Design a protein around this nucleic acid. Structure first.
Ligand SMILES: *[C@@H]1O[C@H](CO)[C@@H](O)[C@H](O)[C@H]1NC(C)=O
Ligand SMILES: *[C@@H]1O[C@H](CO)[C@@H](O)[C@H](O)[C@H]1NC(C)=O
Length: 725
DNA sequence: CCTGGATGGGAA
C-alpha cells in the first residue's frame, strides 16, 4: 500500500526537498525515476555508489546541501556522477566544493553558482561537449568571499562547442575570459571588476543575443550592502566594442557610472530589443543625446535611477517599437507637455514607469494624448492637486497615483484622462467628504482603489459620477447622513471592500445593491454590531445576488441562526476566518442553501460535534484548520453530497477516523490532516485510512507527523511502521 | 535576459 519513495514525495519527479537528509536516499524499483530534487538537505559527502540505483537520472538538483559562509565543505568521490550516463541537468549551487566533480558527457545544463570553485580550466569541464548551459555566479564576492579572483583560463571552455549560455557574475573578474566558445548567445559577466571593454574582449562572439556587462564600475553612493567603488570615473567603453554583434537583442549597461552615451555603441545593434542604462549618470544625456536615433527595433528601455526642467531628447521620437520605458528614481519635480513630448507619437508605447521622482506638479492630461498607453505608474511621488483589485493588468488603461500627497481630489486634475479604466489613489492622505463631484471626467473608470485614506463616507451621492465603476476599494478607511448609504446608488458595482474601516454610530443599518457580488467586510466590528440586537440584523440582506462575503476578523463569538438566515440567500462563499467561534450548529447551514465554500479557520471550534452537515447542503469546500478540534462525531460529513475539499490541519486530532466520513471520503479531492498531534501506537487505524486516500492527502509522505508516543513525537507516521501490530 | 533598485535566478 505504502508510497514507494519514503521519505520523499512522488510528483517523473521524486521530490526529497527539505527533509534534513544527510545522505542520498536508497528507497520498489528505482529504475523508472528520472528526476530527483534534494534541495536544502544536509548532504555533505557524496560517494561512488550513492547514485548507482538511480542510473537513469536525467535531472538532479543538489542545491543548498553544504553552503559556504554564511562554513561547510562538501567532498565528492571521483565516480559519483558517472553512474548516471544520461544525466542532463545538474544543480550543484550553494555547495562547498572547490573543484568540479567528474561529469558524464550526456550533461546539458550545469550550475556551479555560489560554490568555492576558484579556477575553471579545460580539465574542469572535460568531456562536456554537449553542454549548452553553464552558470557559475557568486564564487568571489562579499557574500561568498575569496582572496584574489575566480580564474577562467584562456580557451578553457572551447571544448564546449554547443555552449549557448554562460554566466560568471560576482567573481571579482578583471577581464572577460579569453577565447570563449563562439557558439555563445548569452553571456553574463556583470558585477565583477571588468573596468575596461573593447571589441577584443568580445572577439568571435558573433552569435550573441544578450550581453550583460553591468555593475563593473559601480557608484556606491548610498549602498545598503558592501560595494566596491570603481577606481575609474566611468566604465571605459571602446566605441567599436559592440559593432559585430549583429544578433544582439539584449544589452545591459546598468550601474557602470556612465556619464555620456556614444551612439557608436549601438550603431550595429540592428535588433536591439532591450537596453538597460539604469543606475548611471545619464540625466543630462537622456535630455540631449542623439544615441537613440537608430534604436529602431527597441522594445524596452530602462533609464531608471539616473542622477532646469527634464525633457526627453528629440531622438526618442525614433523609438517606434518602444513598448516600455522606465524612468524611476531619475528625480524630476515637474511633468509638463515638453517633458515627454517626443514619446507621444510612438505607436506601441504601452507602459511608462514614473515612480520615485518627487514629482510635485503634473499635467496628467498629457497621458490622454498618447497613442497606446495602457499603464503609467506615478506612485510614490509628491502630487497634491491639478497643475498650474487593481488588475487591470495588461488590458486596461491604468494609472497608479498611490503614495502621493493628495489630501483633496479636484475633478480638474483628471481632464483628458477620460479613457482611464483603472485608477489607484491609495496611501494618500485624502480627507474629504466625497459627494459626487470629484471624478466627473472619469466617465470610463471601472476600478477605483481609495484604500488607506481618511474618506468621509456619509454622502449618498458618493461616486455617483462614476457610471462604469465596477470595483471600489475603501479598505483601511478612517452628524448628518449615514455611512455606506451610497452603495445602492452605484448600478455597476460588482466588487466592494469596506475592510478594516471606522464603522461609526450613524452607520447605515442597511447595505443595498442589485449588483454587488463580492463584499469584503473583514476586520470590522460585526460582533459588536450584531450584539446591538435587531439594529444590524439585516445589514447585508439588501445585497441582492451577493455571492461572496468576507467576515474575517470581526470578533464574532456567536453566529445565531437569525443572522445567517438574514444574509442574502445567493451566498456561495462565506469566510468567518479568525473569529472567536467556540460553538456552531452545523445544521443551521440550511439557512444558506447555495453555500459552496465555507471558511471557519482560525476559530476555536473545540470539536465537530454540535449537529452535522445537513441535507442537502451544496457545500464543496470546508476549511476548519487551526481550530482546536479534538473530536468529530461519526457521519458528520456524511450528508454533504458535494463535499470535495476539507482542511483539518492544525487541529488537535489524535486520529482521523473513517466513521467521520462514510462513502464521501472517496470523492474528496483534498483531505488535509497535517500538524495534528496524531497518536502513533503500533495499532493506529488512521494509517490505513490515509493510505487509501494518499493521492488526495497533501504532504502525506513526511508532512503528517505524530504527537505521541514520546519517541515518535515530531516525527512522521512512517518514522516507524505503525502497521506492525 | 528576468527581477528590483539589491540581488538571485537561469536552463536550446
Ligand atoms: C543612423 O544611421 C544613418 C545611416 O543609416 C547615419 O547617417 C546616422 O548618423 C545614424 N545616426 C546615429 C547618431 O548613429
Ligand atoms: C490548510 O490549512 C493550512 C492552515 O495554515 C494552510 O497552511 C494550508 O495551505 C491549507 N492546505 C490546503 C490543502 O489548502
Amino acid at each position: 500500500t505504502l508510497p514507494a519513495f519514503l521519505p520523499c514525495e512522488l510528483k517523473g519527479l521524486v521530490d526529497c526537498n527539505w527533509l534534513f537528509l544527510k545522505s542520498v536516499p536508497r528507497f520498489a524499483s528505482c529504475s523508472n525515476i528520472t528526476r530527483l530534487s534534494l534541495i536544502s538537505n544536509r548532504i555533505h559527502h557524496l560517494h561512488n555508489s550513492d547514485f548507482v540505483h538511480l542510473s537513469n537520472l536525467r535531472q538532479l538538483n543538489l542545491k543548498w546541501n553544504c553552503p559556504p559562509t554564511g562554513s561547510c565543505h562538501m567532498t565528492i568521490e571521483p565516480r559519483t556522477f558517472l553512474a548516471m550516463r544520461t544525466l542532463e541537468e545538474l544543480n550543484l549551487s550553494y555547495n562547498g566544493i572547490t573543484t568540479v566533480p567528474r561529469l558524464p558527457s550526456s550533461l546539458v545544463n550545469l550550475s556551479l553558482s555560489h560554490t568555492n570553485i576558484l579556477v575553471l580550466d579545460a580539465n574542469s569541464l572535460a568531456g562536456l561537449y554537449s553542454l549548452r548551459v553553464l552558470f557559475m555566479d557568486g564564487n568571489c564576492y562579499y557574500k561568498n568571499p575569496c582572496t584574489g579572483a575566480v580564474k577562467v583560463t584562456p580557451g578553457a571552455l572551447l571544448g564546449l562547442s554547443q555552449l549557448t549560455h554562460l554566466s560568471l557574475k560576482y567573481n571579482n573578474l578583471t577581464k572577460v575570459p579569453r577565447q570563449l566558445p563562439p557558439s555563445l548567445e548569452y553571456l553574463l559577466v556583470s558585477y565583477n571588476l571588468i573596468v575596461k571593454l573593447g571589441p577584443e574582449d568580445l572577439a568571435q562572439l558573433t552569435s550573441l543575443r544578450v550581453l550583460d556587462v553591468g555593475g563593473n564600475c559601480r557608484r556606491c553612493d548610498h549602498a545598503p550592502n558592501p560595494c566596491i567603488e570603481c577606481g575609474q570615473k566611468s566604465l571605459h567603453l571602446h566605441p567599436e566594442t559592440f559593432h559585430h554583434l549583429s544578433h544582439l537583442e539584449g544589452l545591459v549597461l546598468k550601474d557602470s557610472s556612465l556619464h555620456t552615451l556614444n551612439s557608436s555603441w549601438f550603431q550595429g545593434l540592428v535588433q536591439l530589443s532591450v537596453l538597460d542604462l539604469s543606475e548611471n549618470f545619464l540625466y543630462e544625456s537622456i535630455t540631449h543625446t542623439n544615441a537613440f536615433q537608430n534604436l529602431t527595433r527597441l522594445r524596452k528601455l530602462n533609464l531608471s535611477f539616473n542622477y532646469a526642467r527634464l525633457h526627453l531628447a528629440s531622438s526618442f521620437k525614433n523609438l517606434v517599437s518602444l513598448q516600455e520605458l522606465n524612468m524611476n528614481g531619475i528625480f524630476f519635480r515637474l511633468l509638463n507637455k515638453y517633458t515627454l513630448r517626443w514619446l507621444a507619437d510612438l505607436p506601441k508605447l504601452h507602459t511608462l514607469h514614473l515612480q520615485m521622482n518627487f514629482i510635485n506638479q503634473a499635467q496628467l492630461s498629457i497621458f490622454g494624448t498618447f497613442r497606446a498607453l495602457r499603464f503609467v505608474d506615478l506612485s510614490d511621488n509628491r502630487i497634491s492637486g491639478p497643475s498650474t483589485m487593481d488588475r487591470c493588468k495588461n488590458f486596461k488603461f491604468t494609472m497608479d497615483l498611490s503614495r502621493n500627497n493628495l489630501v483633496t481630489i479636484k475633478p480638474e486634475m483628471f481632464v483628458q484622462l477620460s479613457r482611464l479604466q483603472c485608477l489607484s489613489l491609495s496611501h494618500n492622505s485624502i480627507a474629504q467628504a466625497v459627494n459626487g463631484s470629484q471624478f466627473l471626467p472619469l466617465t470610463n473608470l471601472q476600478v477605483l482603489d481609495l484604500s488607506h485614506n481618511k474618506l468621509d463616507l456619509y454622502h449618498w451621492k458618493s461616486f455617483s459620477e462614476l457610471p462604469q465603476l465596477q470595483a471600489l476599494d475603501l479598505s483601511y478607511n478612517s452628524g448628518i447622513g449615514h455611512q455606506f448609504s451610497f452603495v445602492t446608488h452605484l448600478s455597476m458595482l460588482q466588487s466592494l471592500s469596506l475592510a478594516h474601516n471606522d464603522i461609526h454610530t450613524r452607520v447605515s443599518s442597511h447595505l443595498n445593491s442589485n449588483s454587488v457580488r463580492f463584499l469584503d467586510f473583514s476586520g470590522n466590528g460585526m460582533g459588536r454590531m450584531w450584539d446591538e440586537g435587531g439594529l444590524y440584523l439585516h445589514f447585508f440582506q439588501g445585497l441582492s445576488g451577493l455571492l461572496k462575503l468576507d467576515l474575517s476578523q470581526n470578533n464574532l463569538h456567536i453566529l445565531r441562526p437569525q443572522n445567517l438566515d438574514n444574509l442574502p440567500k445567493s451566498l456561495k462563499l462565506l469566510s468567518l476566518r479568525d473569529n472567536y467561534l467556540s460553538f456552531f450548529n452545523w445544521t443551521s447551514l440550511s439557512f444558506l442553501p447555495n453555500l459552496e465554500v465555507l471558511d471557519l479557520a482560525g476559530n476555536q471550534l473545540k470539536a465537530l460535534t454540535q449537529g452535522t452537515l445537513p441535507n442537502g447542503t451544496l457545500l464543496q469546500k470546508l476549511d476548519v484548520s487551526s481550530n482546536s478540534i479534538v473530536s468529530v462525531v461519526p457521519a458528520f460529513f456524511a450528508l454533504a453530497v458535494e463535499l470535495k475539499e476539507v482542511n483539518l490541519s492544525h487541529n488537535i486530532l489524535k486520529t482521523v477516523d473513517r466513521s467521520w466520513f462514510g462513502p464521501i471520503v472517496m470523492q474528496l479531492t483534498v483531505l488535509d490532516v497535517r500538524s495534528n498531534p496524531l497518536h502513533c501506537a503500533c495499532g493506529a487505524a488512521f494509517v490505513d485510512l490515509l493510505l487509501e486516500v494518499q493521492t488526495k492527502v497533501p504532504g502525506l509522505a513526511n508532512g503528517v507527523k505524530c504527537g505521541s508516543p514520546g519517541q515518535l513525537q515530531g516525527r512522521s507516521i512512517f518514522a516507524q511502521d505503525l502497521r506492525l501490530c
